[PDB]
C-alpha cells in the first residue's frame, strides 16, 4: 500500500475570480480533519461538480494494492484489481516545486504542494511531515470520489 | 462573351437557362423570382446569371455580313 496522503473534502467556494475558460474550473476547497487547503482544477464538462459537494481524496504513488513500483507505460487492455475501481476520477501527475521552507527551519509548519496534471494546476498546503515522500520529479496519481 | 457551360464553383449545367431566363423576363418577374423558378438554390450558381453580360449580340454588328 502506497497512500502518500489521504483525506475527505468538501468545497467552500468554486471560482472566486470569474469564469474565464471553457473546460476547467479553479477550485478552492478545504479539509476538515487536518487544516490543509486544496486549490485544484477539475474538468467540469466530463465531471460536473457543484459547491456543496463532498468527496474523499487520496494521492498514491502507484495504483496497485501489491504496492510494487513497476510502471513502464499505461497499457490500455490490462485489468487487475487496482485502486481506481472504487473511485470516479483519475489524473496522472507530477510535483515540481515545494515552497514554504526557506532556511534551516526551527518550525516548518506551513509547507505547500505544487502539482500540475499535464496542464491542470493543483495547490495543496499543510504540515511538513505528512506531506512527505514528495521529492522533485515525483509522479503521483491523484484520485477522487464524490462522497455524500 | 457567350454563356459558359458549367457553373464555376460547383459544376451544375447552367449553359441552357439563358433562353428561358429571358423568357421569364418577358413575363415580368423580379429577378429573384426568375432565378427561383429556374431552379437554382445555392447562390454560387445564381451569381452566374444575375450578373452575366452578353458580348456577342453587341459584337456581331461588325460582322463581315454578305
Amino acid at each position: 500500500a502506497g497512500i502518500l496522503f489521504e483525506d475527505i473534502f468538501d468545497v467552500k467556494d468554486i471560482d472566486p475570480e470569474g469564469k474565464k475558460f471553457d473546460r476547467v474550473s479553479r477550485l478552492h476547497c478545504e479539509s476538515e480533519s487536518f487544516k490543509m487547503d486544496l486549490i485544484l482544477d477539475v474538468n467540469i464538462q466530463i465531471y460536473p461538480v457543484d459547491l456543496g459537494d463532498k468527496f474523499r481524496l487520496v494521492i498514491a504513488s502507484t495504483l496497485y494494492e501489491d504496492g510494487t513500483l513497476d510502471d513502464g507505460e499505461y497499457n490500455p487492455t490490462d485489468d487487475r484489481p487496482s485502486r481506481a475501481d472504487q473511485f470516479e476520477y483519475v489524473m496522472y501527475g507530477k510535483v515540481y516545486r515545494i515552497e514554504g521552507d526557506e532556511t534551516s527551519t526551527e518550525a516548518a509548519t506551513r509547507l505547500s504542494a505544487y502539482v500540475s496534471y499535464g496542464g491542470l494546476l493543483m495547490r495543496l498546503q499543510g504540515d511538513a511531515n505528512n506531506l512527505h515522500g514528495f521529492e522533485v520529479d515525483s509522479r503521483v496519481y491523484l484520485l477522487m470520489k464524490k462522497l455524500a | 462573351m457567350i454563356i459558359p457551360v458549367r457553373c464555376f464553383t460547383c459544376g451544375k449545367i447552367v449553359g441552357n437557362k439563358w433562353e428561358a431566363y429571358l423568357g421569364l423576363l418577358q413575363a415580368e418577374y423580379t429577378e429573384g423570382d426568375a432565378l427561383d423558378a429556374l431552379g437554382l438554390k445555392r447562390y454560387c450558381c445564381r451569381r452566374m446569371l444575375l450578373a452575366h453580360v452578353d458580348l456577342i449580340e453587341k459584337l456581331l454588328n461588325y460582322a463581315p455580313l454578305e
Binding site: - | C10, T30, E31, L35, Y43, C44, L50
Partner: protein, 134 residues
C-alpha cells in the same frame, strides 16, 4: 500577320481585389480536398486572414458581405462613398439583410474540413469578392 497566343493563369501569376490587396497564385489544390459548407458548396479561392490587421482593409469585409447579400436577394447594391453616416453604419444595416435572408448576422457560417471529415469549431467567414486579373 497577327498571331494569337493562349495564356492561362499559371502558378506564380497575379490577382488583385478592388482595394490594393494584391495577391499571387500560390498553388493548386484539388477540389476533393477543400472544405465544403453546410449546403455543399466549395470555395474556389482561399484567403489568408493575417492581412487586415496592418492593412486597414475594411472595404474587403464590407463589400464581401455585400456580394453575398446581393447574390442572395437578387438586386445590385450601391457603393458610393459618404452615404452611410456614423448614425446608421454600413455593417449594421448591411447585415440586417443577411439576417432577414437566413444566414448568420456577422456574415460567417460553419464549415467542414476536407481531409478529416470533422466539423470545425470556429466558424468561417465567406463572401463574394470581385477579382481583376493582372
Amino acid at each position: 500577320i497577327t498571331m494569337r497566343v493562349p495564356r492561362n493563369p499559371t502558378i506564380g501569376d497575379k490577382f488583385a481585389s478592388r482595394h490594393g490587396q494584391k495577391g499571387i497564385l500560390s498553388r493548386l489544390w484539388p477540389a476533393e480536398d477543400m472544405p465544403f459548407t453546410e449546403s455543399g458548396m466549395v470555395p474556389d479561392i482561399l484567403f489568408n486572414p493575417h492581412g487586415f490587421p496592418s492593412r486597414m482593409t475594411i472595404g474587403m469585409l464590407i463589400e464581401s458581405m455585400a456580394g453575398k447579400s446581393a447574390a442572395l436577394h437578387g438586386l445590385c447594391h450601391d457603393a458610393t462613398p459618404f452615404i452611410f453616416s456614423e448614425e446608421n453604419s454600413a455593417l449594421e444595416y448591411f447585415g440586417e439583410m443577411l439576417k432577414a435572408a437566413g444566414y448568420n448576422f456577422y456574415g460567417t457560417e460553419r464549415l467542414y474540413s476536407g481531409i478529416s471529415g470533422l466539423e470545425l469549431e470556429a466558424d468561417i467567414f465567406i463572401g463574394v469578392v470581385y477579382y481583376q486579373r493582372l
